[PDB]
Amino acid sequence: CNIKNGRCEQFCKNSADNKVVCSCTEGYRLAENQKSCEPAVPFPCGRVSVS
Amino acid sequence: VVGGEDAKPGQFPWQVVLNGKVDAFCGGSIVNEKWIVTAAHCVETGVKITVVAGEHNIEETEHTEQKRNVIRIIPHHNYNAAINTYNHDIALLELDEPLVLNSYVTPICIADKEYTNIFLKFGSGYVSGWGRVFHKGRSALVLQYLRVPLVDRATCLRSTKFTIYNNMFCAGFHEGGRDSCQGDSGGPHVTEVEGTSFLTGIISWGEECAMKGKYGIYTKVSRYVNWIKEKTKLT
Ligand SMILES: *C[C@@](*)(O)[C@H](CCCNC(N)=[NH2+])NC(=O)CNC(=O)[C@@H](N)CCC(=O)O
Numbered sequence: 040c041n042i043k044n045g046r047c048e049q050f051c052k053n054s055a056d057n058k059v060v061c062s063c064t065e066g067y068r069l070a071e072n073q074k075s076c077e078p079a080v081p082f083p084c085g086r087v088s089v090s
Numbered sequence: 091v092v093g094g095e096d097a098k099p100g101q102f103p104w105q106v107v108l109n110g111k112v113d114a115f116c117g118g119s120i121v122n123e124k125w126i127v128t129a130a131h132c133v134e135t136g137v138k139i140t141v142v143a144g145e146h147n148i149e150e151t152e153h154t155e156q157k158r159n160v161i162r163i164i165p166h167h168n169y170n171a172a173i174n175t176y177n178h179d180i181a182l183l184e185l186d187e188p189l190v191l192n193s194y195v196t197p198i199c200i201a202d203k204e205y206t207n208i209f210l211k212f213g214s215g216y217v218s219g220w221g222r223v224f225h226k227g228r229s230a231l232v233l234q235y236l237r238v239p240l241v242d243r244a245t246c247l248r249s250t251k252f253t254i255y256n257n258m259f260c261a262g263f264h265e266g267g268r269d270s271c272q273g274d275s276g277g278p279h280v281t282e283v284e285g286t287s288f289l290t291g292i293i294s295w296g297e298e299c300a301m302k303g304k305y306g307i308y309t310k311v312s313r314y315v316n317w318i319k320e321k322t323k324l325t
């Protein structure tokens with residue numbers, strides 16, 4: 040997780056074999072690429088949607 | 091907020107205003123549909139208070155406003171353990187009826203203790219509110235916001251005779267002119283992480299506002315995120 044947060048968009052945790060596991064806050068799901076965080080609800084926390 | 095700029099509607103959809111025996115006396119942030127986080131010094135008494143979410147201009151009607159009554163107030167249990175220190179300046183407000191989430195009414199994210207601190211240390215956060223736009227001056231009609239840099243602990247320690255606890259941090263500019271102020275307390279200090287904003291501080295106290303050589307003092311939210319999550323559970 041040392042450099043650039045292990046490429047996790049939100050949270051990183053060091054696992055084993057020098058691998059990394061990403062995770063996301065409530066209202067988001069870990070995306071397919073296992074790094075990015077996708078919204079799982081209509082109005083997820085912390086985002087501007089008015090534009 | 092002294093030296094900031096007008097927000098756009100929906101730019102800070104987690105921001106709320108508190109109204110009571112004084113209108114627009116403090117700010118807060120939406121934790122979830124039933125819970126607001128604010129400063130304990132805003133809610134010391136237990137007089138009746140109301141919360142307005144989806145607020146932008148406090149003298150006009152946007153038709154985005156949601157007004158709620160506060161039915162329970164939980165100041166942090168260590169607030170006022172020591173008189174006049176502002177240590178543990180954080181409180182939670184339970185609403186009578188759930189907010190309806192939408193583009194103007196959205197919670198702020200709250201990370202664990204570790205990542206909340208990580209985000210704070212990125213070193214640049216936004217503060218917002220309807221507080222005074224000059225020290226000892228008038229309050230804002232339109233929601234103000236300001237980017238403030240994190241200030242190193244030694245610098246902040248030297249800036250004031252008052253004690254800066256580990257539960258606090260300092261933010262602002264060496265040259266002054268830009269700061270949170272009275273009326274802004276309880277509002278958020280937030281850090282944007284790849285388009286997602288996280289709560290990193292609560293607007294708490296200072297010496298005057300925007301004076302050169304002084305900084306805004308904020309409650310360090312990382313130290314309280316476990317407590318926030320425990321008390322605001324929905325079931
Ligand atoms: C309750 C909340 O609105 C204010 C926030 C002031 C933040 N100030 C700066 N420079 N960022 N908190 C207080 O008024 C708590 N008391 C104090 O800060 C006093 N030291 C000064 C009070 C005053 O000047 O009116």
Ligand SMILES: [Ca+2]
Pocket residue numbers: 145146147148149150151152155
């Ligand atoms: Ca309005």
